Design a protein around this ligand. Structure first.
Ligand SMILES: CN(C)c1ccc(/C=C(\C#N)C(=O)N[C@@H]2O[C@H](CO)[C@@H](O)[C@H](O)[C@H]2O)cc1
Ligand SMILES: CN(C)c1ccc(/C=C(\C#N)C(=O)N[C@@H]2O[C@H](CO)[C@@H](O)[C@H](O)[C@H]2O)cc1
Lengths: 808, 808
């Protein structure tokens, strides 16, 4: 495979030498005692050595040229594995493959030993990871700042069809990629009280937690640029017998701040420990930013600094920057505010109101008393501007306030972000339009210039070259390698839609990926599947808005049709659903149980045979995405219109040769626009249709009464067909669908089933299926995160990207 | 300095190269950003690389030859710093000095950056460390097993003359010497219950904590032997929203087992967490031992395994070995017991009854229910043997029982150790004799063959070559280098007691050490001392039995004599006292405050001038011992006769050219025997005198009434002379001395003061002082830990030591 790079004689020799050096001196093993894990670590240390010179030279280069620096603040970085990604971006993959082969080792076996860095929940966390790759590839002086969670997203086990959570102890064996920087440790303050002096406000009597940074290299694609991801770890300050012992053990309370990722991406809870995490990353990060700024007045700060807020989770950056500039640097309020607004920009990732951060005032008053005072002052000055622009509009003042009245007074962190940012963006054209028309309509009317769109993207390094080398190679054969850092070049593939050789090659790559994935399932999970079946895949977090339940209704429809006419031909399918449920989300846990319960019936019915299989993919995570997405024929993107801000899984499937069945939601709209609606399986209500249904009121009973196939399914669920031992098991699911369904599952059922029949019809014609796939891959170029980051750079940050290489 | 080794052209070149390699690839720094700490780490990694080949080859050698293995079980390993010790034992010191000098670095400055590994309290912990060095130097297949405490002995700060404790965060910057072995992790069981089956007892429903080993290399002196110290770290097993988050945070409870060293070396407390630490090290260690034994029936176990118990702290080894052999390996009781007794040996380190471990039965019943059943069965069978040997002696049965009756039933762990061991030793001849005559008299009468002496020793690598290279060199000039691994060769120095050159050289080395230490005091602590004064040093943990208070009475006597006759000549003295008090020990904390309070008066009295200085040495630890002991003229070893089991500080001072003022206690007896009583300042009651005084009753008032100089001091203390602001501050000290003094401070006062006058008289004659010093250094050979370990090897473990080198 040419895209995997050169295996030079001298290169392979030096890699074998450095591998043996690390096995002996670093791991303190010989080849007699060494396990596969030791071999993985020797390889990881060998590859890491190639980053170091480029890492030092890149940071030296930024010190000398002093470019504007981009600070990407996120509570989540969903990085996955690093070894293969590093080899790809340094052009070392073939050399390491050869070197390990010559030492009697299978490199693909060693790659499987690495733990995922699971420091995120899903889309928001994975976007941050794709963005770091694109910022390095585009030569931006960019730093990712976050928390080094000791425990990432939980490992999912399925026991009796139920999700169980296990701690993700990802640092158990060590992390060869990070470098502890205990020398750059910074203090973070909590609690205390404000006293007003002659000189101004002073925040006193605080408790201190130390923020210790760990730096991870972020290599650009073959440009010798290595940027930094700096993650903060919480450390206690060093300040009778049981009393002395207990004081040492109580250090754990401070260190708990960085212990564990909150897994509730569905529902904001308002936990004190989460607020501590948010302030911890903000306070440590801003001291680091200001230190770097002063090391080569504050008028130039926005010319040298951009802070990008990944949702409201780091929104305390706005009042913390005001606190430092006013209280410590003694800038006047108006000058500090000008600097803050020009520095900060905010990205929104959902319109669902239960996910929005609204912190109780009493929590902020106790933990961050000076921040609450600054937020009140921001609010008063903001509402003074609203009053002057819309005189007499007293309801607008209530609606736009950063302070929400009620039983419990709360701060709306989204309102704070809009007030304190020069740019607010959604993550797909339809989402950005919904922000301006609905939830932020009042803010758009006051400051229309702030509101932007930045359609999401995915890195084609991880999401094509790394996970699908077969497809990357047959593309490179025709159009060369330049497309890997310029994905718009895939448009050249439209010239090959009638090329019999290319059609055969695209279909062969998919067949190989499906055999490989079918094998993985048998080996690791003792599961057998028909690799000639259509691979129908829905992988994403379990949320009612994502409508895994609509997919379930289709699966039961196909099962019932087969039982009714057993001797009729149907296109064989393997229906695969995977994703984690948030631990407290009862309905999400019941939906996983329904999927496994359907599998229990369908997969053991002798009349069905190998015509229908339903598999729940356990422990969906970045490493499993890299295996299943290249194997997929059909991508399920079936959110209720107006609920999925963008989606990024959708883009991964498009790039890897799956066709999409989807609603006109999030980026699906732009994907259909790029490929042509004739090359997408689009069904269901548009946003306008959902609004009209809400106006007259959604009555699920009407659909149950009018669609006999739907009635039969509800009767089967209610009566215990899928839970014979426990017949009322799914009553909560039935009750939600019939009486309390916010996401209108029944309203899209008929169009979905009809559209799935059209998928089955096209799959019976392999040549026409593959030609439609080529039209999708060829038009996936817009969905490169390189395009997304170039737009952030030019339209928000005010910096020019570069594909110019640094010297090696 | 020849003893520091060769600086070969090729060696210096390769060290400079590997230093620069580690600075770049390991630390990810260049010489522009590097701090002294980075340079320390580059040097440590460079030196560690030289250990690795020898470490792998040593363990391979033990696998091939399959010698009997020695397992030294200790809750404490007081290791201090590793860098200089490693360079000394590999003969790299001059090469590294040259290499660092050529790179523009001062190696002595880099050595000062290393944290002490403070994993012990004092004598018992430091003995374990000296023993590991001697076992490696004598080519024994020896393993030290302990706990990797996250926090060692607290850092001592003195604030307003009071001890404050700070957490010893010794792993803050990382530990380059250890290698995590997460692959050899073992389970340890707690709580649960015993059920009796047809097959026998089963310990079920337990909570599991994981024991993760970290291995540290232990290099022998220039023999290419590198042994292992394996320390266990506690890890939690991987088994709504607040509930999930709280379950992850509760992992801290399991991990608290290895968090912190108990600092109470004075008084046994009976804390559950301490019992968990003791079982944790025993259970993990014994599984490791049995695994290694089975990897090349149990009849051969005592031929292949020796377990040495460092006091009773790992005594649960006895019932744990019985539990594994009976419950898991299904050996009959009598065979298991035979194997256990032949495997285990016990070392006692004190006769003070408050330090003896007596665990409440209710704690053992809850935590270790199967161990309690095995202890009851051991007790019944042991008391059956006592009854058959001494028929009708019902009081002997009560006295010898492992079970102590009372309000709270307790297990006497010393009784368990004697019953379950083939050898019991004290740590100095007088101590071993006291064990047989008093506290273990009944056990000696039943099994006299078990009772041995092993007089303690110190390693001459750390305690001469490393800390006093000047003295090591002038010795090597005369008698060569062989004495460093054969300390009896120092006897050859008796030939030089009348050699004017050697007298001048010994006196010059002491003067240089005193100037160096006087400089350290000014630099680090802004303290000025007269370097021509007699350096009068008492450094050791603060305990009433050690009688720092008797030293205080002498200091006040000298001060009062000077105030009475200001214009009379007295030999100038710097009186230095240092050591940590256990956090709950109120009297020990008051004694530190008295020493600083005396300093406050004496050091600011213009009439005294530079004739008397009283300094409290803050944060006494192994690194400070290495600085102050070479600087000392007079070693204070003034414990009440019968209380100090051995002492080892005494031996360090003797080897480094200080004269000793001491009681006939512990090893002081053997030191005076070796050197001649005419070359020791021996004073005070012998053990026989203490016994006679106890028989008629100690009345402190009698001494107060008869000694006017003593009355004056007590009046000064009581009246507030040393605490003008708070005149009753020392009332508790006065009340203890007058009414409740277990250690008879007043009874030795007159003889102590008279003996101190004889010290002052000899110090006025430099030539005769130095000749007496030469007679001490020349006869210090017996106090090498190489001699001690050779005796353990031949008389307890049944293995022959070897000075034979392994190939490099
Ligand atoms: C702990 N807490 C209260 C949390 C709240 C929210 C979240 C995460 C999301 C939200 N909202 C998220 O991942 N949104 C997705 O962002 C993708 C990238 O822009 C879109 O492609 C996708 O459409 C969004 O759903 C995580 C934690
Ligand atoms: C937590 N706990 C209850 C503890 C109890 C005791 C100890 C330590 C000692 C005792 N006993 C000790 O260090 N004893 C010394 O052993 C030296 C070497 O043999 C002798 O030279 C010296 O004379 C002993 O005092 C530590 C912890």
């Amino acid at each position: 495979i040419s895209v995997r790079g050169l295996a030079g004689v001298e290169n392979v020799t030096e890699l074998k030498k450095n591998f043996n050096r690390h096995l002996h001196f670093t791991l303190v093993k010989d080849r007699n005692v060494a396990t596969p894990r030791d071999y993985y670590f020797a390889l990881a240390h060998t590859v890491r050595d190639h980053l170091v010179g480029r890492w030092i030279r890149t940071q030296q280069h930024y010190y000398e040229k002093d470019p504007k620096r981009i600070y990407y603040l996120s509570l989540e970085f969903y990085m996955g594995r690093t070894l293969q990604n590093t080899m790809v971006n340094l052009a070392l993959e073939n050399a390491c493959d050869e070197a390990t082969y010559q030492l009697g080792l299978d490199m693909e076996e060693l790659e499987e030993i690495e733990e995922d860095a699971g420091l995120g929940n899903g889309g928001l966390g994975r976007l941050a990871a794709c963005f770091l790759d694109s910022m390095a590839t585009l030569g931006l002086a960019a730093y990712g700042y976050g928390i080094r969670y000791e425990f990432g997203i939980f490992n999912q086990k399925i026991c009796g069809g139920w999700q169980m959570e296990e701690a993700d102890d990802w640092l158990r064996y060590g992390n060869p990629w990070e470098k502890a920087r205990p020398e750059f440790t910074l203090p973070v303050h909590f609690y205390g009280r404000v006293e007003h002096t002659s000189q101004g406000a002073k925040w006193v009597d605080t408790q201190v937690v130390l923020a210790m940074p760990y730096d991870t290299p972020v290599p650009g694609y073959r440009n010798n640029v290595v940027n930094t991801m700096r993650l903060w770890s919480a450390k206690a300050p060093n300040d009778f017998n049981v009393g002395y012992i207990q004081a040492v053990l109580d250090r754990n309370l401070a260190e708990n701040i960085s212990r564990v990722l909150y897994p509730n991406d569905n529902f904001f809870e308002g936990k004190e420990l989460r607020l501590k995490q948010e302030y911890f990353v903000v306070a440590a990060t801003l001291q680091d930013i200001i230190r770097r700024f002063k090391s080569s007045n504050f008028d130039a700060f926005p010319d040298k600094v951009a802070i990008q807020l990944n949702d409201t989770h780091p929104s305390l950056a706005i009042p913390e920057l005001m606190r430092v500039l006013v209280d410590l640097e003694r800038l006047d309020w108006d000058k500090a505010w000008e600097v803050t607004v020009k520095t900060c920009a905010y990205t929104n990732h959902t319109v669902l109101p239960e996910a929005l951060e609204r912190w109780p005032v009493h929590l902020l008053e106790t933990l961050l008393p000076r921040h609450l005072q600054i937020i009140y002052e921001i609010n008063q000055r903001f509402l003074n501007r609203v009053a002057a622009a819309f005189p007499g509009d007293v309801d607008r003042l209530r609606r736009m306030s950063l302070v929400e009245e009620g039983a419990v007074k709360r701060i709306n962190m989204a309102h704070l972000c809009i007030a304190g940012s020069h740019a607010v963006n959604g993550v797909a054209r339809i989402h950005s339009e919904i922000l301006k028309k609905t939830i932020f309509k009042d803010f758009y009317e006051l400051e229309p210039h702030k509101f932007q769109n930045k359609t999401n993207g995915i890195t084609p390094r991880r999401w094509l070259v790394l996970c699908n080398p077969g497809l990357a190679e047959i593309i490179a054969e025709r159009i060369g390698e330049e497309y890997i850092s310029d994905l718009d070049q895939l448009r050249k593939l439209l010239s090959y839609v009638d090329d019999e050789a290319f059609i055969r090659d695209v279909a062969k790559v998919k067949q190989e990926n499906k055999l490989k994935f079918a094998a993985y399932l048998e080996r690791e999970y003792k599961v057998h599947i028909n690799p000639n079946s259509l691979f129908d895949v829905q992988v994403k977090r379990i949320h009612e808005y994502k409508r895994q339940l609509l997919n379930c209704l289709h699966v039961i429809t196909l099962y019932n049709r087969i039982k009714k006419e057993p001797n009729k031909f149907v296109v064989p399918r393997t229906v695969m659903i995977g994703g984690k449920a948030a631990p407290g989300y009862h309905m999400a846990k019941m939906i996983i149980k329904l999927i496994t319960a359907i599998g229990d019936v369908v997969n053991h019915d002798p009349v069905v045979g190998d015509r229908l299989r339903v598999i729940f993919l356990e422990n969906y995570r970045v490493s499993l995405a890299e295996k299943v997405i290249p194997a997929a024929d059909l991508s399920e993107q079936i959110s209720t219109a107006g609920t999925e801000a963008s989606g990024t899984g959708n883009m991964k499937f498009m790039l890897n040769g799956a066709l999409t069945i989807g609603t006109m939601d999030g980026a699906n709209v732009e994907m259909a626009e790029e490929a042509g609606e004739e090359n997408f399986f689009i069904f269901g209500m548009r946003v306008e249709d959902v609004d009209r249904l809400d106006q007259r009121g959604y009555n699920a009973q009407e659909y149950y009464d009018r669609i006999p196939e739907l009635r039969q399914i509800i009767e089967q669920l209610s009566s215990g067909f899928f839970s014979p031992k426990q017949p009322d098991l799914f009553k909560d699911i039935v009750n939600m669908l019939m009486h309390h369904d916010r996401f209108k599952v029944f309203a899209d059922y008929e169009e979905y089933v009809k559209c799935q029949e059209r998928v089955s019809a096209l799959y019976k014609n392999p040549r026409e299926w593959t030609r439609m796939v080529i039209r999708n891959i060829a038009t996936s170029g817009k969905f490169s995160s390189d395009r997304t980051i170039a737009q952030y750079a030019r339209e928000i940050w005010g910096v020019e990207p570069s594909r110019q290489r640094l010297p090696a």
